[PDB]
Amino acid sequence: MIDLIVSQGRVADRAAWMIEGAARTARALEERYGLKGHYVGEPAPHADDDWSVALPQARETLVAVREAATESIKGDNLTVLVNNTCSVSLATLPVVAREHPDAVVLYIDGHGDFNTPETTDTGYLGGMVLSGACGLWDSGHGAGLRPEQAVLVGSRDIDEGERELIRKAGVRVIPPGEATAQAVLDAVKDAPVWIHIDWDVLEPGSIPADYTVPDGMLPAQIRAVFEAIPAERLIGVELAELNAPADSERAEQAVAVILDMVAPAFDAAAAR
Ligand SMILES: [Mg+2]
Ligand SMILES: [Mn+2]
Incomplete structure (x- = not known):
């Protein structure tokens, strides 16, 4: 079975349509898989606030997500957050x-x-997520992720300052031209696996690019990753940062690509 959790509260959002993008993604999964999502948080407008202001504002939503995710993870289903x-x-x-x-x-x-708070150029909390979970700074929501067990997939053009924190911490990077399924399989070795996706990893939608080498990852590479993780090793999946207005034709087109990428993983979990 699949436990679906959906965040609808503002968590530092600087983009206008990411709460709507999460809702539309969640809806397509509910209809495809026969699920009812657990919706958490109250929408609020996007703003360019500093992380030190946006983070306390997000306290109620983050605590509610943590509690729903905890229940799902303690059980025996695939935890899917649409964030x-x-x-x-x-x-x-x-x-x-x-x-x-x-x-x-x-x-x-x-x-x-x-x-970290000391390296960020924008003050944007969304640029401080993996470092916060690895404990390079205190988010107020815990840490505990060993950087040795964190693998950045498809990251590119990283600030030399940030890239030096990443290597001193021990976080591996697999850039998009190296991010094959086997490369990713070799990275996780014998471990159980949590997949977190930020859709800005993808090559900008112009798959009429048969004669161009892409700079981001192609949908097929993401699908190939989902196909290759054994269902019994997949703990859960987070899908984040679809910026598409609700009702738009763009959102419908985007969620159809998303469903195709994640199908290998979600199909095998729905069959369990
Ligand atoms: Mg990103
Ligand atoms: Mn991100």
Whole structure:
């Protein structure tokens, strides 16, 4: 079975349509898999606030996500969070690392999200998620993820400052041209696996690019990753940061690509 959890509270969002993108993604999974999602949080407008202001504002939502995720993880289903922003994972990753100390986190993202309060140029909490879960700084929601068990997948063009924190911490990076399924399989070795996806990892929608080498990851590479993780090793999956207005044709087109990428994993869990 699949436990579906959906964040609808603001967690530092600087983009306008990521709460709607989460809702539309959740709806397509409910209809495809016959599920009812557990919806958490109250929507609020996006703003360019500093992390030190946005984080306390998100307290109620983050605590509620943590409690729902904890219940799901303690059980025996596949935990699926559909999150508006990666910052929701400040609450879920410490649960995962606590309940599964040996789990490898595949953090699939165009970015490193490994800034600390002292390195961030923008003050954006979403750039500080994986570093917060690894305990380079205190989010107030725990830490406990060993950086040795964190793997950035598809990150590219990382600030030399941030990239040096990543390597000193011991976080592995697998850039998009190296991010084959086998490469990712070889990275997780014998561990159980948590997959966190930020959709900015993908090559911008112009798959009329048969004669261009892509800079991001292609949908097929993400699907190939889901196909290759054995269902009995997959702890859970987070889908974050679809910026598409609800009702738009763009959202419908985006969630259809998303469903195709995640189908191998969710089909095998729904059959269990
Ligand atoms: Mg990103
Ligand atoms: Mn991210």
